[PDB]
Structures are given as structure tokens and as C-alpha cells.
Structure to design on (1067 residues):
């Protein structure tokens, strides 16, 4: 119903291997379970080895509750239960940040929907349901003074946060950064206010100081200094600071005021800043401005490639380079009413979907079979409640001829993934624009 | 412990599937209601262990409806009596 | 007094069967009771079999309190009590979502109005009144119509109409489009930048219509594997409570028309707000211009309008005159685009239709000829009859009452002569009805 | 247990209907008040079971009014004394 590990995918098809090895006709939750302990190497497989549940012990209970074996094997499908069980492992992994399902999650997903044959194999093999979700769990896991208070989230620590080697590039606005520092030293117009048309770049300048203080060239006393970010918890945390002062605050959107320390970098617009200094005059005083020129066109390009990898998340990029060249250049002169790093990115996204979108569209003049198909099922129902079986079973053998019929032109539509899956070049990008201009 | 249950299948084919097995000491009757098909199971004499067991299987293919069974006996639509599973296996498994 | 099950209707007429089987002249609550246990198969019938009340036990108490038997049977009617008992079962079913009355409800309806003969049969057959309403209850229950999944609990609870749901059982209207409009939503929704979409147009174009669009396509099935397995939904002390019970469940997309913990969780929206009102939100900025992000909703192509009407034509047959006439719809629509001229091209239409979509069912109900006067007359009578009856003046009423119903049947005969004002208008429709509506708007 | 009651009928014809039966060892008197007709029943010597019984019937045709009976005896409007049912049956049943 999507994409999982090999281990998942193998374990699933492996249920089918077991579907037939016993001759049954629908693969229920009991076969998914055989699937897991029989690929013997998944985390799922590993766990079962713990509870005391080899393939030996299990299959004996199962055959002791179903056995042979109508070799029918008339191209089988799932149990509705097990289809639920699959829908579930997908969720038992949203619930774990695991970007992709695998052997464990499916075992997780079975417990969750406990009503079914697997579940009974075990409540029969003296293995309550929770002792089991446990075993899988115990095989997966995770990944400071005043920081105590601050260190909510509100408002994450740019500094130590990017001290952990954990930081990327980052491309500037390299002289945008350093002007944040002439100001963040002064004693005059001390606290710098970051004015520029919104974005991106802006948040990237403070991720700068962060990068700069730490590794490491910086000056007029600024070491071991964090940059931190993002009402019934208000000035609360703010007192962990009037009592220790290694800290710049990064703002987004207000002034509880220079009652003392408080080093902050300003998130505000060409005009929005004039919504401080007019009522005055903490502005011409404390707070003090600097602008975000739109990042260098060429710098613009090698900015995406960094988050190219990370949007690879929708299927096409990484690549093409020839694909980005577009996004960026189009914007700088061809409308051309934003900021030279923000725009480009947006464009990708239109296409950063618009391709997996066009990918999962609908087959040819193959609409009317759906309509035909519809009434047959219908015609089938009416007669079964009239029964009239044969006079219908006719009609089932007949609905089903049309079923596998349409599929082989919808599964024949991974014939359509190819003609755009991970295809990328300007082709897709600029047609985007025929609208915006 | 109770020894009679009423289950709802989402689509009818779910019922055919169930049929393709072993009913076993199990009287069973099948209604049609709200477009969905309910099925009514009646175990005569089985150990509680033996029934909690069996019922497991059933719900691989159904869910258990909160539906008052007499609502069906009155306002349902009968389709097959007593040997409800058995009959579907006849006209449908091959 | 309406329509019930067979079982109901049979049990009721069955009271009458019993009315006469004993020779009595009015069927009271005692006969309705016999009616129930003697159709022996209704849920009502079934219950009585529980308390230990077969027809045998009952009829013996009843004959032990009335017996023969003036064969009069002069075309009998109810007891006023029992007429109450019937009015009641109708309510003992409103109180159960049961769209139609039946054997149970009538048994329910009897207990409720306990003053009467049935009630005593039982307070005589050592069967207090509540032990009885119980037995019926323990033979009906819930539904569970929804199939599922855990987190849906706090959520699907509130509030708030699970659009994926209404699109699952396919119990969902088309609806037209704005088909290329539904698509532009999924870009704005398959992203990472402008995560969340917002539709702006006159409000008007039942924007809310486009949303049901997803339900249908996310299901079967043309949409990125980037969005399969999700849910559309809509809409004070119930605060952060259920919202916490959702961030803790990513599979959710939401609908609004009016707050912002924006972008925080997977809290993903679809917004419907005026041409301008939005001006007044990105004006808030700039999590606005960021997270949420807009698309222009069109006043449907005039023809498109027509098709929307018909699709829900079969569904405005509720007010008794449609389906049809097509020729009439085209007017509802067409006149609006060019002639006044103050809305969206699909709301306007339906409003014309509804103006008329009772109006004619009404010209049906008007008072008959100037026979407003008869009733006026009949009044003066009762008085003479009545006030006379207080003086007596007895046989001075006998003929006075008789003088009365002489009138009445004459009245009701010409009051139901206006079923003809029905065959004339009822189920009509054509244009002329509309153009009226129109001229009565300018 | 009390052996005298006051009942209100919505419309007069309700009273005619009641008349068409058997009063039986039952003195009865009929008032007119607030446009609605009250009827005052008086059982001489009957078993409690026998009266709770009889009164059942009456309330197929009336309801039982909270009305102080002496309010009628004073501020009512007498229509028929003692044999109130009996008299209506004369002038009205056929």
C-alpha cells in the first residue's frame, strides 16, 4: 500500500508465500505474522525470537486452527483485517519519525488492531498483547545553567545547537553577517534590527553568528554565547537571564524592554521597523538596523542544492542542476516582486509536487468501464438479496472479469510514473510561470 | 459468557471469503441492512476458551456490531438462515 | 395518524380487530395493548413475551374489567387517551433517531402516558411500569456507523463533520467544478513552503463545495502517495484539549471560514474567506503570507451552474414539486447572471428555486373559495349548541349538533375540494413561477 | 384511599363518549368551568382494587384535574347533578 524496507516488502510478500504453503485463499493477520518470524532477520523477526516464538511454535498453533487447503489460489487478496493492519503500521511509524515503514512497524501495527487471528495465536501462546509491544520497543531509541528556563522551545539554541558539528554550509549574505556584529558590540545603537524583504534569507543571518562565534573567529568579547529563537509563561523564563548573560535573542514578529541585558536580532520589514522608532526612541537608541540585500544570483543557486537533498522528499530532486538554474534566474528579472533567494525555492515546490501530482493522474478514455462496472456490482447486490445466487455469482464472476481488467491499465500507469518520475529540467519549471506572467 | 454474536462486513465479498473455511458446530444466519451485510453467529456449547478462540478468526473478516440483534430479526432483510456460511461457499467458491 | 411499519400499522388495525372481538365501541389503550401481543412478532410483541405476558394472561384481566359487548360497532373511533398514546409513540421515536414508528415505539408510547386501562392491566399483573420500559430498551441499541482508528476519537467527536467519511460510503454529492479548481489545491497542499491553501471569492460560490472535492479524490484515488491516508474536516471551554488530541495524529487537514497556532503542529488548513477579509490576515502577517496561501474561486461558468442544480434537483424533491422542469432551472440561473446581479452565479439560482421551492407547494394550501365564510358560520353554531347545552335546551341541541355537522362535512368536503388547487399547481414549476420571483425582487 | 375524583375533558363530546358506557354504583356530577367541562365522580363503597380499576377507564376519556372540588361547588357552573353520566346518555347516544 506504499513503500517500506526491503525487510518490510519481503516480509509482506512472505505472508503470501505462506498464504499458499497452507493453501488458504485470503492472507489474514495470521500470515503477516508468519511473514515476520520467517524472514527471521527483521527487528520484527528478532523480537519474536525473544518472546519464545520461533516459526516452529507459531505455525503449529495456526495449522491447529485452519489447516488445508483449497489450492484455489485464484489470485488471492488480503483480509480486510490485515488491510487495516497495514494501514496501521504506516501510522505506528508516523508515530516514530521513521520516514519509512519496516519489519517492526508491521509488528507494531498488528498489536494495535488486536482483533484477529495473529492476536489469538499469542493470547493462546500465553503471551499477552502488551508484553509483546514491549519487546519491539526495547529494540529502538532516541537519537546546563540558566538554559533551564530559556531552554523551552521556545526557543532552541542556535549556538550549542550548531556546535554539535550539526550545522550545514551556510551561504550568505557573508557581509550581511558581519554587519550584525559591528552592531552587536557597540554600547551605542547596540541591538541590531534585521530589516529586509521577508524570508529567508533573514533567519539565515543569525544562523550565521551562531556559526561564527563557535568556529570561531570573533571579537570584542563574544565567546560562549548562545543565539536563541522563536503568555502564562511570559517574563518567567526571562529572569534566568538577568542572572547570567551569554545570550543573544533571535526574534520573529512587543518589547519587554532593555530593563538590562537582552541581546536580540530584529525580524522586521522595510516599514515595520518604522513601527518602533516613531513612538521612539528605544530605536535610535538600543535596537539598530541593517538590510538584507537579495543573496547573490550564483549564491542563490548553490543554496537550493543544499536543500535539494532534503526536498528529495517528494520524488524527483535531487537534480537537476539544470532544473534549478531555471528557478533562480527566472525570478531575478522575470517578476521580480520578491527577494532573489526566497522566490526560486517556491517555484520548485509548485513542481515539488506538481510532478508527483501529474504522476498519479487518470488513464485514457477508460472512464466508461468504471460506469459499466458500477451497475454490475449493483446488479449483483440486488439479486443476492433475492438469491438468485447463481443468477448473480454469474454476476460476480462477471464483475470480477472487469476488475482485473481496469487494473492492468491503472498498474499500467506506473507506465506514467516513468514519463515524469524524477524528471525535472526547466521543462517543468517555466511552464509554471506562463501564469505568473 | 455469551455465545451468540452479530458481525458487520463492509462489502459482501468479505463474506464469501469467510465462507471459504470451516463454520464448525456453528449455526449462523445472514441479514442485509443499511446496505452493509450483518452476519449472526450462534455457538451451541463451547468452552469459553474455545469461543473467544473461534471468534478471533471471524473478525479477521468482520468487525462486531453494537447492533441489537432483534432490530435485525424485525427490521432487517433475511438472506440465508441457520446455515448462512455454508450456503455462500456452495454458490461462490469456484 | 401518519406512517409506521407494517408491524406498527398491523398492530394498530389489530387493536380494532380486538375492538369488536369483544363488542366494545371505542378502542382504548387496552386494545392497543392487545394489538401488540397479538401480532406476536413485533419488538413490542417480543418484549411482552418477556415480562410473562402472553395474550392469554392479558385478555383475561381485560375481559375481567369490561366484557361484552354492544355489537354497536357503529363505525368506531379511538379513546382520547389512546389518541394521546399514538401522538406519543411518534415522539418516543423522535427520541431514538428512528425515522419511522413501529411496534416498539407504540409500546414505549403507552408507558409514557400511563394513565389508562393498559397501565392498570399490568399494575394489576404485578408488572410495575418501569420494569416494562426496560424490557423494550434491552432490545435496541447504538449503531457504531463509522467503522475507526484511535485518534479520531477526541477529534471526530467535537465537532466536526468528517468529510472523508461522507465521501467514504459515497453518500456524497458530485459536485461539479471548479474541477481545475480542486487541483490547484493539491499543489498548495503537496508542498513544504506554502503548506496550507486559502480560497477567496464571493462566499458565495459555495466555496465550501470545492472541499468535498478532496474527500473524493484522496480516496479513489488520484493524489500523491504524499497525501494518501488523510482526512478532511470542518467547523469554547473545549480548548487546547482536542487540538492536543490531534497534533498527536498527523493525518489531518482542516477547513475554516472565520485562532492561529499556525504551522506549529501538522495543523494543516484550508481557508474560505472573503475577497478582502484575507487582505485582513496576511495584513496580520507574516506567518500568514507564509504558511497559508491562496487561490481564486470562480463564479461558475453559467452552464456549470445549471448542472449543479439538477445534481441536487432530485434532492430538492423534499419540498414537493421537483424534479424538473429543466426549462425552469435555466431561468433560475440565467436571469441571475445578467439580471440582479448581487451574488455568485450558483447561490443566486438555488435561491430563486427555493423562493419558489415552497411558494407553489403553498398556493396549494391557500384557503378555498370565499368559503372562508362557512367556518365563520359554523362557529355561531357550536355556541348556540354549546351555550344551549349549558342551559338545556337538550333536544334544542340534538338538532343543533346535527345542524352543526350538516355544516362541517360540507366544509371539509370543500376544504378538500382544494386538492384540486393541488392538481393544478402542486408539482408545477415552469418559468412563469420564477419570472414572478424575479420581478418581485426589483 | 380516596373515593371521589374531579376530571377535566378537553371537548364536551369527550363526555358524551364516556356516557355511552356503564356508570355503575357511581354517583356523578358535571360542571362547566374555564370553557372546559369538569366531571365529579363519587364511588360509594368499593374495594381500593375496584376503584383504581374503574378510574382507569375514566381517564381514557379524561385527565384528572388538580382542581379543588369546592372551587367548583362555589365558583363553577352546574349542568347535571348526581346522575351526570346517565343524563347525557339519554339525550345523545342515538
Amino acid at each position: 500500500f506504499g513503500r517500506f524496507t526491503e525487510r518490510a516488502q519481503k516480509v509482506l510478500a512472505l505472508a503470501q508465500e505462506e498464504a499458499l504453503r497452507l493453501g488458504h485463499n485470503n492472507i489474514g493477520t495470521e500470515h503477516i505474522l508468519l511473514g515476520l518470524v520467517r524472514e527471521g532477520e527483521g527487528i520484527a523477526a528478532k523480537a519474536l525470537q525473544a518472546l519464545g516464538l520461533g516459526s516452529e511454535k507459531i505455525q503449529k498453533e495456526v495449522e491447529s486452527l485452519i489447516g488445508r487447503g483449497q489450492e484455489m489460489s485464484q489470485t488471492i487478496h488480503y483480509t480486510p483485517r490485515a488491510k487495516k493492519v497495514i494501514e496501521l503500521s504506516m501510522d505506528e511509524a508516523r508515530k516514530l519519525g521513521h520516514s519509512y515503514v519496516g519489519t517492526e512497524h508491521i509488528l507494531l501495527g498488528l498489536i494495535r488492531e488486536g482483533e484477529g487471528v495473529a492476536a489469538r495465536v499469542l493470547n493462546n501462546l500465553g503471551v499477552s498483547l502488551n508484553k509483546a509491544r514491549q519487546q519491539v520497543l526495547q529494540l529502538l531509541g532516541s537519537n546546563s545553567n540558566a538554559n533551564t528556563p530559556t531552554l523551552d522551545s521556545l526557543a532552541r539554541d542556535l549556538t550549542a545547537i550548531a556546535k554539535e558539528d550539526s550545522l550545514d554550509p551556510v551561504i550568505g549574505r557573508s557581509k550581511e553577517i558581519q554587519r550584525v556584529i559591528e552592531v552587536l558590540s557597540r554600547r551605542t545603537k547596540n541591538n541590531p534590527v534585521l530589516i529586509g524583504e521577508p524570508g529567508v534569507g533573514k533567519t539565515a543571518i543569525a544562523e550565521g553568528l551562531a556559526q561564527q562565534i563557535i568556529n570561531n573567529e570573533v571579537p570584542e568579547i563574544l565567546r560562549d554565547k548562545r543565539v536563541m529563537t522563536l503568555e502564562d509563561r511570559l517574563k518567567k523564563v526571562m529572569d534566568e537571564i538577568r542572572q547570567a548573560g551569554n545570550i543573544i535573542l533571535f526574534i520573529d514578529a512587543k518589547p519587554s524592554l532593555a530593563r538590562g541585558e537582552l541581546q536580540c536580532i530584529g525580524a522586521t520589514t522595510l516599514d515595520e521597523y518604522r513601527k518602533y522608532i516613531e513612538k521612539d526612541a528605544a530605536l535610535e537608541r538600543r535596537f539598530q538596523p541593517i538590510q538584507v540585500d537579495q543573496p547573490s544570483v550564483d549564491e542563490s543557486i548553490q543554496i537550493l542544492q543544499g536543500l535539494r537533498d532534503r526536498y528529495e522528499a517528494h520524488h524527483r530532486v535531487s537534480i537537476t542542476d539544470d532544473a534549478i538554474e531555471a528557478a533562480v534566474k527566472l525570478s531575478d528579472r522575470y517578476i521580480s516582486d520578491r527577494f532573489l533567494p526566497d522566490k526560486a525555492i517556491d517555484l520548485i515546490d509548485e513542481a515539488g509536487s506538481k510532478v508527483r501530482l501529474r504522476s498519479f493522474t487518470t488513464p485514457p478514455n477508460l472512464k466508461e468501464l468504471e460506469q459499466k462496472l458500477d451497475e454490475v456490482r449493483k446488479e449483483k447486490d440486488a439479486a443476492v438479496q433475492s438469491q438468485e445466487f447463481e443468477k448473480a455469482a454469474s454476476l460476480r464472476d462477471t464483475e470480477q472479469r472487469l476488475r482485473e481488467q481496469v487494473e492492468d491499465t491503472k498498474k499500467s500507469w506506473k507506465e506514467k510514473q516513468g514519463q515524469e518520475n524524477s524528471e525535472v529540467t526547466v521543462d517543468d519549471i517555466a511552464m509554471v510561470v506562463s501564469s505568473w506572467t | 459468557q455469551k455465545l451468540q454474536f452479530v458481525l458487520r462486513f463492509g462489502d459482501f465479498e468479505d463474506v464469501i471469503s469467510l465462507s471459504k473455511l470451516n463454520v464448525n458446530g456453528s449455526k449462523t444466519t445472514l441479514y442485509s441492512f443499511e446496505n452493509r451485510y450483518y452476519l449472526y453467529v450462534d455457538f451451541c456449547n463451547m468452552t469459553d476458551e474455545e469461543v473467544e478462540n473461534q471468534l478471533s478468526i471471524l473478525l479477521e473478516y468482520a468487525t462486531e456490531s453494537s447492533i441489537s440483534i432483534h432490530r435485525l430479526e424485525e427490521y432487517g432483510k433475511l438472506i440465508i438462515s441457520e446455515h448462512a456460511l455454508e450456503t455462500i461457499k456452495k454458490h461462490f467458491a469456484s
